Copies of this chain bind each other. A is one copy, B any other.
Amino acid sequence: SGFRKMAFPSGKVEGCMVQVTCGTTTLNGLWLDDVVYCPRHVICTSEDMLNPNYEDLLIRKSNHNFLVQAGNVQLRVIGHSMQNCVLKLKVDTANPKTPKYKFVRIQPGQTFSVLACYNGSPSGVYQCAMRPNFTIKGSFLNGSCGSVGFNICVSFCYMHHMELPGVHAGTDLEGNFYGPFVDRQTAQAGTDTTITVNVLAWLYAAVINGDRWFLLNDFNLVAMKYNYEPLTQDHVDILGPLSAQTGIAVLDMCASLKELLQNGTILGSALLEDEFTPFDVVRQCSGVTF
């Protein structure tokens, strides 16, 4: 019983957090095998950010211009390359704490844990959603760049690159930004919408936990007026297991959310929560371990 915003256990990722330094600029890096991944803007001076030509800036930098420290020890860099917006620094030492891992590019609406890090050291962990406009609503201070988001074998899906004038943007671990954003300090995020299939998953969580007072082409007409993402049959199939668990059909739950949108606590929140996936609900409500 109970429902909470739950993050994955962060131990396997803490053992991969190193501190990358280049000139004055120091940020966080991800040490897996004999390679360290970090935002390529580590090579940028303060004046460089306004309009960096990365290839030119990187060419002016050599292997020894990169200080990689794992806790107390300093690793030796024997190679460097740029993959899209991430820097790959080959080191002479495989990380002995490298977990089984994969790199994954998630889709809008999916969630993950962020281990927020400063100077290579963990600060805290929290759960996040990739918004439909490909930002995330996190808690990121200057210095947190390079922290990663992940699901758990660890599937890394996000590296933090920038704080916008109060949401945040970043890349997958191949360095491609999520969204239209570029790693340059110029003003840059379109209309965000609410993740409908996620709100429906959370209403099922509510019913599972005893909170039931609120109990398709038609539904999308309503949701569109309220800046809710349209609900597709793929989304209905995803909610199938929750429906079979609760004995409440999917279109029945949508009918419930319609009235909620027009008329205005559920699981102790006064707003409709859209940062729980259907997999999140099943995971938390059936106690999946790792």
**Residues of chain A having any CB pair with chain B under 8 Å:** 1-12, 14-15, 115-119, 121-126, 128, 137-141, 143-144, 163, 166-168, 209-210, 265, 268-271, 283-290
Contacts and interface: CB of A to CB of B under 8 A. Distances in A.
Q: How many copies does the complex hold?
A: 2
B7 A166 contact: no
Nearest to A136: B2
A287 B118 contact: yes
A265 B168 CA distance: 20
A133 to B, nearest CB: 15
**Most B-side CB within 10 Å, residue of A1, A15, A166, A283:** A1
A170 to B, nearest CB: 13
Contacts of A10: 9-11, 125
Contacts of A268: 137, 271
A3 B117 CA distance: 15
B289 A7 contact: no
B287 A126 contact: no
26 contacts: A1-B139, A2-B166, A2-B167, A3-B139, A6-B116, A6-B123, A6-B139, A7-B7, A7-B126, A9-B10, A11-B11, A11-B15, A11-B122, A116-B287, A117-B289, A118-B287, A118-B289, A121-B290, A123-B289, A141-B287, A143-B287, A144-B287, A265-B271, A269-B269, A269-B271, A270-B271
Nearest to A168: B2
Contact of A270 (B269, B287, B289): B269
A132 to B, nearest CB: 16
Contacts of A285: 141
Contacts of A115: 9
